[PDB]
Amino acid sequence: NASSGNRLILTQELHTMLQKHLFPGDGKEAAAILICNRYEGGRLKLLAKELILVPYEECKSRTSDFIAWPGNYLEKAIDVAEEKSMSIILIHSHPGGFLVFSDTADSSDMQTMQSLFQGVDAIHGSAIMIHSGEMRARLYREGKFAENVELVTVAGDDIHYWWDDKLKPIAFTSGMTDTFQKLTAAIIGVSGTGSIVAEQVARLGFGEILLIDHDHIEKKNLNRILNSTLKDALSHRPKVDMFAEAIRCIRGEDISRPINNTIFSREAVLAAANADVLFCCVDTYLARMIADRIASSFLIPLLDVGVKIPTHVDPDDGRKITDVTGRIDYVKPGGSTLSDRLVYTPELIYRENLNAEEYEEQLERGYITGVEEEAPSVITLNMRAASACVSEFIARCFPFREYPNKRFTRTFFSLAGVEEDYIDESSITQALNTRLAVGGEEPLLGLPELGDK
Amino acid sequence: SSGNRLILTQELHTMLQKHLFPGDGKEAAAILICNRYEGGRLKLLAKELILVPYEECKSRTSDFIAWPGNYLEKAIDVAEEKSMSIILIHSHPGGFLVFSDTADSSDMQTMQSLFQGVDAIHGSAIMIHSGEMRARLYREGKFAENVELVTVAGDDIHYWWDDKTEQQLKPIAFTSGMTDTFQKLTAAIIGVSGTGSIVAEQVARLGFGEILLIDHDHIEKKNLNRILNSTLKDALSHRPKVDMFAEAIRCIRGEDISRPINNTIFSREAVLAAANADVLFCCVDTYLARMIADRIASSFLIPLLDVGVKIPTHVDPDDGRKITDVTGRIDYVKPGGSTLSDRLVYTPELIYRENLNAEEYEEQLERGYITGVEEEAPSVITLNMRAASACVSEFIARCFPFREYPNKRFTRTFFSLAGVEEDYIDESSITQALNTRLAVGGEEPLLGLPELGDK
Amino acid sequence: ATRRDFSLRPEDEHYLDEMGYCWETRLVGNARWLIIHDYELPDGYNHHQVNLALLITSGYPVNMLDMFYVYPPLVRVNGVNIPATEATVAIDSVAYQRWSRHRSWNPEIDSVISQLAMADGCLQKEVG
Numbered sequence A: 001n002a003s004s005g006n007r008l009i010l011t012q013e014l015h016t017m018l019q020k021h022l023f024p025g026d027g028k029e030a031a032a033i034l035i036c037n038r039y040e041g042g043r044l045k046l047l048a049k050e051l052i053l054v055p056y057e058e059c060k061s062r063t064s065d066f067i068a069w070p071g072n073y074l075e076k077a078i079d080v081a082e083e084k085s086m087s088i089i090l091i092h093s094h095p096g097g098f099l100v101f102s103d104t105a106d107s108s109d110m111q112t113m114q115s116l117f118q119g120v121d122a123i124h125g126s127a128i129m130i131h132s133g134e135m136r137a138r139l140y141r142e143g144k145f146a147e148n149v150e151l152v153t154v155a156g157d158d159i160h161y162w163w164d165d166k167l168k169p170i171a172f173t174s175g176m177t178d179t180f181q182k183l184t185a186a187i188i189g190v191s192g193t194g195s196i197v198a199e200q201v202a203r204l205g206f207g208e209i210l211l212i213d214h215d216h217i218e219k220k221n222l223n224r225i226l227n228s229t230l231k232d233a234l235s236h237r238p239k240v241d242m243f244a245e246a247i248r249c250i251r252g253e254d255i256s257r258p259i260n261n262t263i264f265s266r267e268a269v270l271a272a273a274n275a276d277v278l279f280c281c282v283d284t285y286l287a288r289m290i291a292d293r294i295a296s297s298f299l300i301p302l303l304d305v306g307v308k309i310p311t312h313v314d315p316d317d318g319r320k321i322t323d324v325t326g327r328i329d330y331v332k333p334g335g336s337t338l339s340d341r342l343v344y345t346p347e348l349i350y351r352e353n354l355n356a357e358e359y360e361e362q363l364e365r366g367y368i369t370g371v372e373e374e375a376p377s378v379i380t381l382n383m384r385a386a387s388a389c390v391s392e393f394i395a396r397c398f399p400f401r402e403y404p405n406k407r408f409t410r411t412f413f414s415l416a417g418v419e420e421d422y423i424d425e426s427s428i429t430q431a432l433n434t435r436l437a438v439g440g441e442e443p444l445l446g447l448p449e450l451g452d453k
Numbered sequence B: 001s002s003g004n005r006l007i008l009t010q011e012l013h014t015m016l017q018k019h020l021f022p023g024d025g026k027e028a029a030a031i032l033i034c035n036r037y038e039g040g041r042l043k044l045l046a047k048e049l050i051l052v053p054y055e056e057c058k059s060r061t062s063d064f065i066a067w068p069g070n071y072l073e074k075a076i077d078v079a080e081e082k083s084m085s086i087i088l089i090h091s092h093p094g095g096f097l098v099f100s101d102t103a104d105s106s107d108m109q110t111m112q113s114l115f116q117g118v119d120a121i122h123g124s125a126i127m128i129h130s131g132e133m134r135a136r137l138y139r140e141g142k143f144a145e146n147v148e149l150v151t152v153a154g155d156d157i158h159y160w161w162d163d164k165t166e167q168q169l170k171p172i173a174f175t176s177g178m179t180d181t182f183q184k185l186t187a188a189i190i191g192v193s194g195t196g197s198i199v200a201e202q203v204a205r206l207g208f209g210e211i212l213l214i215d216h217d218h219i220e221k222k223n224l225n226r227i228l229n230s231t232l233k234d235a236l237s238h239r240p241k242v243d244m245f246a247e248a249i250r251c252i253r254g255e256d257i258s259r260p261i262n263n264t265i266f267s268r269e270a271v272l273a274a275a276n277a278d279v280l281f282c283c284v285d286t287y288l289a290r291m292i293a294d295r296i297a298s299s300f301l302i303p304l305l306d307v308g309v310k311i312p313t314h315v316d317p318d319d320g321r322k323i324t325d326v327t328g329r330i331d332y333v334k335p336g337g338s339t340l341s342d343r344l345v346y347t348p349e350l351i352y353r354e355n356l357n358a359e360e361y362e363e364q365l366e367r368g369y370i371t372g373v374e375e376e377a378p379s380v381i382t383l384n385m386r387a388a389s390a391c392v393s394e395f396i397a398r399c400f401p402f403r404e405y406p407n408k409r410f411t412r413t414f415f416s417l418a419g420v421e422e423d424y425i426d427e428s429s430i431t432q433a434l435n436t437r438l439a440v441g442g443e444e445p446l447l448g449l450p451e452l453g454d455k
Numbered sequence C: 001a002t003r004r005d006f007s008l009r010p011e012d013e014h015y016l017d018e019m020g021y022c023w024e025t026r027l028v029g030n031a032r033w034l035i036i037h038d039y040e041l042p043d044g045y046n047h048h049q050v051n052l053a054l055l056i057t058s059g060y061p062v063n064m065l066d067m068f069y070v071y072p073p074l075v076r077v078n079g080v081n082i083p084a085t086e087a088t089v090a091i092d093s094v095a096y097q098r099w100s101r102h103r104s105w106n107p108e109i110d111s112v113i114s115q116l117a118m119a120d121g122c123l124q125k126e127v128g
Ligand code: NA
Pocket: A013, A334, A335, A430
């Protein structure tokens, strides 16, 4: 139901810049222009890419209820958006009244929206911001008002959802469910951890749940996969089909969307790109890499979770558990990526995708290092990690902690070491992310394998 | 899972071990008076320990020992009232005799004399220096059956199986060897609640042999956000919680391993079924339930893991009610150690206020003694899962140590999702009151509660 | 040979075209092979042209291109073997010489282009 409402996503950095320009302190209206890419999937997603600020000095009038700014900046925006038919969104301070003057004519808001369409054959919009940051937007189709943006959102250290139909609801409350009911969650990997994440997402009330996985239930994984059964293992049932049916039975509605495929596929990516949050629960580097590319290209907050039980072998006792650890990583669009945090690397992905004979011969040559041996995964550790992963999302949508959510960008706990650590977003080094808000620019995700013909 | 059992407290076992192995390499003896629980399986609840002084023993050799019979006799006098069991303990050899002022007795002759004095089952066991303990039993004074498992639930949990091998090495956690141990054990989940549904799911998926499920409540649309395996059809059917989950385990494990008890823990039916378990998981958020679970653990010498979560709220004078904190607690009670009572998890005052008649409740409101206000927020699946996983992980760690510190440091655990802090308490920091029910069995009234008695 | 079983990056493809190479992209099983035909070598080898090949790994260009391959096998004109060039790899039933040459990979800058640049730099090095 609430799974096709259009979206307008800004990055934290861009929104912070916009808010500053729109509320400099003089109490007068200011103007700016967003240039957005689009993903026209199940729902329309406007992905803010470029920001033009209209300098106060160039404006002919600036008042607490009105502003008049020159159309040379509307021509700059059209020039930026002409090549890719990008969407242009005008932004103005809370009152919002404005005109656009040329040297020969003035343009009302409705006439300025007609001018944008004549310049670019695409959807365009007009938004308004209030002092606190909240935004509301109206989409104009074919130069004439049409629909309002159902959701304008910024996924920053805190996650912001500004609904059209709109104190803040506290956590674990009805208002929380109502926010989740309008959202779509993607679970990449319906695994030991993934199936626990999926269960929580279902019972928490999310409106749409994508399940991406190629694997099947087996007698081996009947000790970890929630809602799996002996019958499913003996019939080698796809994991997504199994869990899609369980959600339907639990929620009494077909909210699940099973994707029987690897995340590394056009089908899974283009489906995951519709989600409002990504839960990466695959234990491969390549999978974590694909999930991190989706998050930046389609401005989707990503939560990546991992667990590991490394084992050694003592000559006096025998095989021993070295450590019992877990990791939760939250990745906001524009902030540090999983690549920045070295969750995966080119070297790490190479060794993994080597053949069985390729891996051994390279290992003999000493160019590649050997993989670390580990114990069998256990349901308890998976459960400890998956509960923290989903709790991280709640804390960022409905802050309840005694410290800024930024302090817990990365989390590393240890059941054996009985120790838990946290890393701040500000202590992680970020590399240039030119692929931010590019959407489905081909080749998809920048990978020629995922490209169209 | 099945087998007659012999459970010893850590205190008794440690003191017993010390005597049996003083350090000279010579045999030592000791009588062990046990109480009995005769349920689905036999349970020998060691209650009293008699040590035989090395001086009293006429002789002590590396492979033999001979002690006076006046100690066999006095032990009989103590067991006469309740026809209690009498287990004779020895060292690695086991060879022994019981001399007297006039005549002497062999192993079997000594066994036959114990039965003559007390009409009950009496046996004889042997201990090695490591502490591992084998045993056997005699009924009517004649050889009967061997004890399948001698167990000690201390800071670490020790399971000494009859079917053991030298080549068979003790296993590590999260490994196949863990599954084999669990397959022989029975776990009782008290409350198929938001947390207990999660504890029970893990227990079933970790391969436990028999799973008891005790709960009177049922599935409603209000708890389809927490109860694992529950389904909208069940909430429209108001299906009993223990029935829904029993069928879920049957499908998961392809076997009928769960025993659904559709009743409260405050019932003769539920206590007597729980008294057969090897571990108790208390997941009921009431003071009465937790007290009942703590009385079971001490009376029937079962390790208990009590888990609770709380989302406390406070009223900001200008902003309204907020979430003060999001928290969880895990308590591990070993038979003979500090109890939930000793840790103030409940008090008589707390259990009185909670369980007041509708007339009492109304009078207290009308007079201001109570306000009847919900000082907590709704529970969430994520917090239930964070506590349940740590609860079962505690059991794995006590059965198969893997932490870098002694398990004793973590007798109590407290975590704070909001304060982002986790604290631990040591069993040595806690204070212990006299436990008058330790290894008391099903002596009536059950658990010392007349309500639970048989009238 | 205009075989094009898969696409590379658009920048990779613009480069190969600008360089005038006769290049093909061939699927062999699940192996993606880029093959440049008649690659002119520097003087000093037994041969003067070879087929220069790169295995396009899965996840490229975030996954790294690790080595380069050459057929016919190459040896210095004096006959002395080239270090770390002993292994061979079947490419559509052709035994290519595998040059074991490794570097650091940076997805922000590394592509077919720079890996072809390494390959040339290594070929220049082993005759000089
Ligand atoms: Na940035």
